[model samples]
Target: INTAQLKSWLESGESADDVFKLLKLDSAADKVLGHAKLDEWIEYMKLFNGKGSKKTTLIKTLTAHFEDDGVARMIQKALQVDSTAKMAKRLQFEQIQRWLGQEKTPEEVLTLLKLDINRYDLFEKPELLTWVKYLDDWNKMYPDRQTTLFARISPLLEEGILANMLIKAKSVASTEKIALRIQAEQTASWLKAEKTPDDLFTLLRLNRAEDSPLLENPIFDAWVKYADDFREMYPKVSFDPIATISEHYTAAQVATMIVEASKSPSTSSIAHRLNTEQFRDWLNTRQSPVRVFKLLKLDEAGDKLFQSPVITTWLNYATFYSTKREKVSITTLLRKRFGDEVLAGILTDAQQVPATKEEATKLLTSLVGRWPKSRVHPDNVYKWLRVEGREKTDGFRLFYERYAAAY
Candidate 1:
């Protein structure tokens, strides 16, 4: 029969026997009638949007009508099943769908389809694990036929049947969410692990060239606390929390962490960290020294400047800037900044002043690296002059006569 007749016969609900007899197949007509459930099969196909079949039942009906291997021969003649290769692919697809329909797990279906089930490395992609577990395998296996197999595995994930593994892995994380929570979870783990501040800082990769934006992260705030607590708990363990802070952070942010970690929580405590050249350099780079002085409340240092580390930072700052503006060295700048009286107090309090004329001469030599041809290093001489009652000494008498001659 032609296509139009075959279509009309199925649409008009003709029994398989009638269609066979109409096609002059009375020899097998009675055989076809015996498996007459073809009517309901056609109805099932139409009612279900015209796209499916009970292949086993259809095979039974066709076999009875064609008698033994004759049905297979006819299928070989049909252009729709023209080649063994194409037919084998059709059967393979049907088998895959059948395996998916049965009482079997997703892993079982993958095994029947000859797809690997243990490819855990495919799980590295950010999609849900099942898609990685099943769909990824299917696409790799049937790269050219992906669209046809999509629906087969989609419901397996959605309907929660293949989700037998789902409940176990509900705790598995998403990537960006992991990116955010990884640090939080790891920090909690580190703190509870009681790791040293250096260990924590090292693990977190803080103060790196490409540091995470952590100024506001509560997780990082926990790190600050960890460093602070660690220093107090193990005083001999020498880890500087300031070193862990990234240079990109603001000076105010550094000060906040400093005060937060301090027992006194005052600006004076900030001077302790600032005393280091590295910390002072970072602070100077992040802000002008003038602003830093105000921000750290060094103005409140009052007469305590001599005792405060602020004096050292200021001396360094003055000496650093001195070379650009004038020929003055640190000694000259210090003398100009603080007059001879306070300068002597600072030098003596810091034990920088020499105790005797011999030590004074040696210190000058050390400071200048040589004796003067035309003049003594004026910086050391001023400090020498400020020494109490040194001017009245015999050494001063001899030195002043020579000093007056040079002027």
Candidate 2:
């Protein structure tokens, strides 16, 4: 009894009793009749009318048989042709029978849909197993459901769906449902498909809903790639970007890149996001923490490490040593070692935050990575057992204590 034409029946001048006879909905016959006078009730019933099992079957059939773009046109055409509920049902059945009969060929469905196939619904029309195959032909036309209807479809369709999905999601969204759905499920997909970063992200019309996902995305290739590798390479910095990066990037790429970058050391670049722990492992093999410090520039504006552990750990070292050399001004040492931008971060976190176990994990991920290098980056907080007084102060002790606990 979950079928409903109640609002449609009522709007078309049918009486209350017909609600039971025609609508066959999960809706309350009394509820609709009782609240028919109120605006929200009328609208609520209208929304529910489309919520029928038969309607779901109808849409699911269309979702199954018709392309994504075709769903709307199919909806539009049926409404245009049918004056009666029966006629509407018949119109949809006709489309379904037609699609089913022809083995659901793209040409037939495509022609029947008469839609802008340039839209992603084309790729969204089929099941996952058949998606690539259907996509090969659909591109013979062109969807990210798992990530975005566009993300999956984009790899197949390239950029067409990316732009359209954004436009369809933004323009005139408050009054309707179409654009509202496109972004929520699509941004992660965009990340999987995007190799390069988007400079035009501001212009693409993102809101706070979208803003947070980027922070969690696989925007940096190295971090993602290296994160996965750490468990194996430094099985012993035994951390996963999962706690940090997985919120944004997918399982497929980032974790793998960590090892791949480590294997190829000739390129000394941080193009992708990587495991700072693994980087520590690599640094331990060849370089000192001090010499590595000289290679980075916090002032470079784009230095990824400045915001990462390299800077944080450097803060632990620079400040710990500064405590040892109480005569040397911290400001002077930081300025000489890290330049102004890094010196700013050094002054803040090491000089201030790293006190408790919670604050310790915040400083450098591991204290082992502090001295030379290690097989693993510490995951939990530990103490600077060797140092006393200032070295054993909250910031230094927990900073050492928290990360050292990983080993």
Candidate 3:
């Protein structure tokens, strides 16, 4: 039985000895009994008549049963009682290292490393580096299985070792995953270096498409100096068209074409030619609003292209874009088509309006000229009517009535 099944049987009040026997514990039991259980068994032996003899046999049998050679060595080291000799500890460490070096499975290596790191203080930087080199060589031989294995060990490497590997990976443009990993590590290094905005901007443009996702990351917001510069440089180059073109070309060819296109002084004119009406129309005709929104939000043709709900429900789903010009245009178009009351209803529906009287007054005042007076900024006719009530009591109303008749 597996450890899980054995554990269940023991937890049900069955004796471990009984479960151990059921699993044919004579040969395989030692491998299954972890250190805690072995300690418990040693304590249990003390209750017997020939306790000393039983304890010695139990210890020897338990030590021999540990399947992991590393664990056995560790137990031996812990039990060593010879005060004059340090050779036991040294021998255990060597045995563990030799076992680790003997082409062990990734799971075994991880287990051994965890145990060694916890139980022993003899681990060194050189030993970790050697292990990393072995893993790298093994990964090269068995690329598919080793990818995940290497990824598992990646976090354990020191920063300097990780940095060196990252730099090497960055220079070698082999696979997309490799390129992405290199970019991630480079970004981490940039964050550590506390680089200037200009430096970060240059780094971002190095592989703009691959690295653009970094903009969405919250960590980038912490670097205010770089963030300000990044904001300024954001509009300098538009990536939408390039990304679209890249869908039809290989990365190398796309890079080459972009370079060639950049050489001309009137490259903007060339860009205008490439973004023809037909291409824009084709994009607008796509069925998915989500896909269309991405293009509309990024591309220049977004504002000019109209997708009315009658023709397309996508128009109703379009949200305000980030640019100030786009926001102004949207505001103008919304006011003209829906009027202020409709906009107010939309805001109220969205629960964007304030609840307090003072806030409501401010909101009303701000929207005064935009909305119809009847629906929004109603006149204080009731206040004026109250003044008429006072005037009638004071005879001012009668005086005004006589004056009005004479006129």
Candidate 4:
């Protein structure tokens, strides 16, 4: 008899003589009957108590009957008479955990467990599917098994359970095609919801190549706009797109971020952080200062970039190429871009002084338009020009007397 048949016979209150007659037909019992315990076995025969001392004796007798070599099968058959139901459930749990720990394939697990793909009844059973809930513990223990476990159990999962797997498997999802599909689905959903670039990148796997074709899609541009809107509203949040996303994006592509912040008043603070070295390299590729300024939206910028280090780089770039392109000095460009009065005020606020004859000429030209209301001190100018031994010039004296007399 199978263990289930034996357990049913014991539960039905069958007599000891009747049970023994049935047991005698089995190979294990026939061997025990031929052994030395035959005398005690016959004595306890008539008083047969299946749930009492008699059942314990049968289990022990079968265990001793096979004790010298293999008793595992014998003991399990023996114990089934009393605790088969609980034992079966506990055994299923152990087998599932064991298969996962041993890195068994899902197909192997299905074959071993006798699960058929067409049979939803067996798959839906709570006893068989409860291991899905412990996936987190399994991941915590194995660390590297998360994606494997997720793939192993994904077909059996539904609704909330599948969502749990997706969440846990998110970082490693790209390892498997199904997990990658789930990741892409989630990314597409987030994109439609208008999430930030940082948030979108969180869904994307790390270190994607710069030349990845998916990055060329317009969806990524939408992500950029969302990030720009967020940073524009909360400028001091300490987020830098170039540092955060340089893996998949070129510096030129994200350099457009500076202009987004520059056009808004509240978001102007972090505009400087967007001006990275890679951004400078990209700026070098621009044809002219006018083009750079146009791309940066500096013409639309009120006073933001003018006060930032961004202008320093652009000014340097513009200065280096000025003679070749415009045949004009940067000072002339600056005075033209910003009116002479504002340029003079900015230079004055910067405590700018000239020691070179060229520097002195530029300073006087900028100040010439604002001389009537200039904040620059004539004494400060004399002191700085003294370095070049121009403090005693008659031209300097005439300007100083006139400027001081105005004050």
Candidate 5:
């Protein structure tokens, strides 16, 4: 038959035997049947069992059919006739998991897995244990993909299964580097929740010393002493700043040491003393922003001026420092103190030149354009200008004219 005839016959779902016979089985017909006639082949196979098929013949025919389609539904139907074969179950499981991992529609994967194969029996097999382990390993190797997979499994996994998985995770963690990192992070999270000295110490050992410092009144001096003792006693134990500092003083007292150390002009003294890097490291290790701010205030060099004890402290501090007219470091400090709006307005007013009536009108228009959405009213602007002695001539009259025109 031609393309139209074959299409019509296939769409009608006529018996495969009828189509084969009508098509006359020529070379072209055989090619069409071999490649294009999946539905027809399925229909033929559905009725083939009644023809007294031997096990070998049936397996061969179904295998060839699957080689063509790769459809699980077809393999499942073939399994119904050869229900005793264990390989069929293995193949089905493999196919289903492959499909699931590809993120195929859940409906499709579930439908394939739920096909007459025993679900509970499959779960009981050690094969599933191995499969889950492999999947967990895969996730560890590819963390981003693993996170996505975990999210997908979140709702489906039972509490017991999840607990068991966590147990298995600990068991298999040493096998992969990624798994070890995950376990380390999980341990830190647990310690954070527990908030105990021993737990914090354990976290410190895990290189989570910074986070542990945030814990309330964490025997900081004691922990530091312990770290120092371990390093001293073990000899091979690596040197750490926290351990080194804890040998000399308490966490509360170290801030003073840092301030003192920052003052040394010598390179070695500065390096050996409270270096900025070490100070930052120590600061992050502690959770208190107040303590960090106080430490930062010790050095007012460069533009680190505003990185002080507090915003209020910086504001009060700015008023005492005499500023150069051309240098806006003081203005910047004021901006940080009084906030952008007020300080910007004050700076703009300070910079304005006294003008005649016409010049004042132009200046007013320029000022309005620059700060079109300013909250300060024109009257206030004029008053501030006048108060600041910005108008030496009839500038107020010019400003009034411009304000009237703009309004």
Candidate 6:
């Protein structure tokens, strides 16, 4: 309300505090309402309309009492005031104002500007993810089929171009959303991952050349200390992070990622978010170039990120099955794809450690290694190559011998 009108109400025996509240003036005015000089309080109660609102007593109050707005105000209106954590953060307000400086209102800023895509390693041109299946297949066939029909349009993988195609894909979000999502998810994963310090890549900030996340989070150093202690304590057996956090770990796994074994709802996302979900999705698009091709069920696409794992799991377990009598041995297969030198590189690692089927199964499952939740692991390469351990024979003597043999 204008000062004259507000003054009329107050002079009409209206409670000054109630009048100010009714006028939607600063709640800080409540403390010094009639206590202030009438002329001073008169001009101090002006509301902000930015273009229409002039700086007045509210700001003077901002200087005097500080952070007495009490009730949260609308963000755009609150921009004129510094309410600290109240109205909106002062830093955020300044940032937005700077971003909006040259552009009037909203002028369509680039999506990644909010998140700074340059900060994290984006691995590829962002459009690769946008094109979904088509670009992915083109990538797989590149060295093989440079002249393939679909390969001609391969370079059309630009953001707007791919995103326009995303009209037929899924909802496309901006860099703002993607950045926040990765940030929270990565930090959340690190908090859980720190329990064991198994995989270093999960802490991608270790790769940061500057503004490293490790510096920002001292707690990460502390957690690494715990991991280091556990390793030092058990030099013989392999370290297990989950076992290290057994009290919280069992309580949650005992919930299976949804609820506790106590049947209570879980507040901590530590167990479910990082471990189980990561294993399930495998972060398909980030891990492999071709997954989206098959994931989206598009033209000229092959299947599965780990074609080997898919092959082994489906080949033996499917309704129709067979064995090595008609088969090229795993030795033959790996030798064909990676030549004898690469094959020898792997064999040099494993040794002449031979055993029966049970021991082989126990040995394979018992082995431990550090890797992130994000991708197809190295052993996934084993399954993909069809050299993985089989839980059952295919009912032929050939299959029996295959299972009897150990890698």
Model 4 agreement with the true structure over 286-350: per-residue lDDT tens digits: 55766666654556655444544344445545665565445445565665777654654455434
TM-score between model 1 and native? 0.25
Give the better candidate number (3 or 5) by lDDT: 5
Per-model TM-score versus the true fold = 0.25, 0.30, 0.27, 0.30, 0.23, 0.20
Q: On residues 26-115, what C-alpha lDDT tens digit does candidate 6 reach at each position?
A: 454333322344334454343231244344333333323323112112222333455323433443333333333433121122221211
Model 5 lDDT on a 0 to 1 scale: 0.40
Runs of candidate 2 exceeding 4 Å displacement: 1-94, 118-156, 159-285, 298-310, 316-407
The residue-level lDDT of candidate 2 at 105 comes to 50
User: Which candidate model has the greater lDDT, 2 or 6?
Assistant: 2
Q: Please give the distance, in angstroms, between residue 263's alpha carbon in candidate 4 and its true position after superposition.
A: 17
Candidate 6: which pairs clash? 308-383, 308-384, 309-384
Q: Which candidate is the best by lDDT?
A: 4
Report the lDDT tens digits of candidate 2 across residue range 359-390: 33433333223332433333221212222334
**Could you list the CA RMSD of all candidates, in the order they appear?**
21.0, 17.2, 18.6, 17.6, 19.6, 23.4
Candidate-wise lDDT, in order = 0.43, 0.38, 0.38, 0.47, 0.40, 0.33
Candidate 5: stretches off by over 4 Å: 1-36, 55-291, 302-304, 307-407
Q: Where is the poorest 10-residue window by lDDT in model 1?
A: 158-167
Candidate 3 runs further than 4 Å off: 1-63, 69-92, 97-330, 348-366, 371-407
Global local distance difference test of model 3: 0.38
lDDT of 5 by residue, 90-150 (tens): 5555554554456644323333334213332333332333333445545555566554323
Tens-digit lDDT track of model 1 for 188-211: 444566787766654545554254
Tens-place lDDT per residue, model 3, 12-120, is 6544344334445445432433434444443433322232232333434433444344344443534344641263455444444444456665545555445335322
**Cα RMSD, model 2:** 17.2
